[PDB]
Design a protein around this ligand. Structure first.
Ligand SMILES: Cc1cccc2c(=O)[nH]c(-c3ccc(CN4CCNCC4)cc3)cc12
Ligand SMILES: [Zn+2]
Length: 204
């Protein structure tokens, strides 16, 4: 049982999440082919995801990661876009659904930028876009993304395109740069904290 609690737009928590979502928009070298063309989002609602079993898996793993990393779990708030967003908020993140085609190997990817996670809301390369109008830049259909708690532990900073199946010895994640891509190889190293419902906006 998952419970979705609506945050009020007047709430400082809602405002912090939207600020983070809006302010991390950047330009992509694909000219918005995957996510669409926009400079801003229209945030419809923001919901806190509550699930006892998911919180327990996450908290149990944070404890293990801190023991291995001098009592530091090194948690970050990172974005995630997926066409499996409903399965995440009910069953959690699953490394058995790792992104094989990723630059840093078969892991679960998170972005520091909401605009990067938006390219994956309809699948790899933006897929076929919105189910209704098969448009990767649909401004009508409501999209969804997550703003997650990510247990990075001891991160391994990678610069090359070395594909890894697991984190290097002694490490709990991979940070990749040429923006930054965060990779985790265990589903229980991320909690889907907030479910953001939004639209991409057509510039005037
Ligand atoms: C590369 C990258 C960097 C930063 C952020 C992201 C992100 O938020 N999602 C995905 C992402 C999510 C889900 C899927 C879809 N499935 C399809 C079936 N195989 C597993 C992935 C693909 C990519 C990739 C990504
Ligand atoms: Zn549409």
């Amino acid at each position: 049982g998952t419970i979705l609690l609506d945050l009020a737009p007047e709430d400082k928590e809602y405002q912090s999440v939207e600020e983070e979502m809006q302010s991390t928009i950047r330009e992509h070298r694909d000219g918005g082919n995957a996510g669409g063309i926009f400079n801003r989002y229209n945030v419809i609602r923001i919901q806190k995801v509550v699930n006892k079993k998911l919180r327990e898996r996450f908290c149990h793993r944070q404890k293990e990661v801190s023991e291995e990393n001098h009592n530091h779990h090194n948690e970050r708030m990172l974005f995630h876009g997926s066409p499996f967003i409903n399965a995440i908020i009910h069953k959690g993140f699953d490394e058995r659904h790792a992104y094989i085609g990723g630059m840093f190997g078969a892991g679960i990817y998170f972005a520091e930028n909401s605009s990067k996670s938006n390219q994956y809301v309809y699948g790899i390369g933006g897929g076929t876009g919105c189910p209704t109008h098969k448009d990767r830049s649909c401004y009508i259909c409501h999209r969804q993304m997550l703003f997650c708690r990510v247990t990075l532990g001891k991160s391994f900073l990678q610069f090359s395109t070395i594909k890894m199946a697991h984190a290097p010895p002694g490490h709990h994640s991979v940070i990749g740069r040429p923006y930054a891509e965060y990779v985790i190889y265990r589903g229980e190293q991320a909690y889907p904290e907030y479910l953001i419902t939004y639209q991409i906006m057509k510039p005037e």
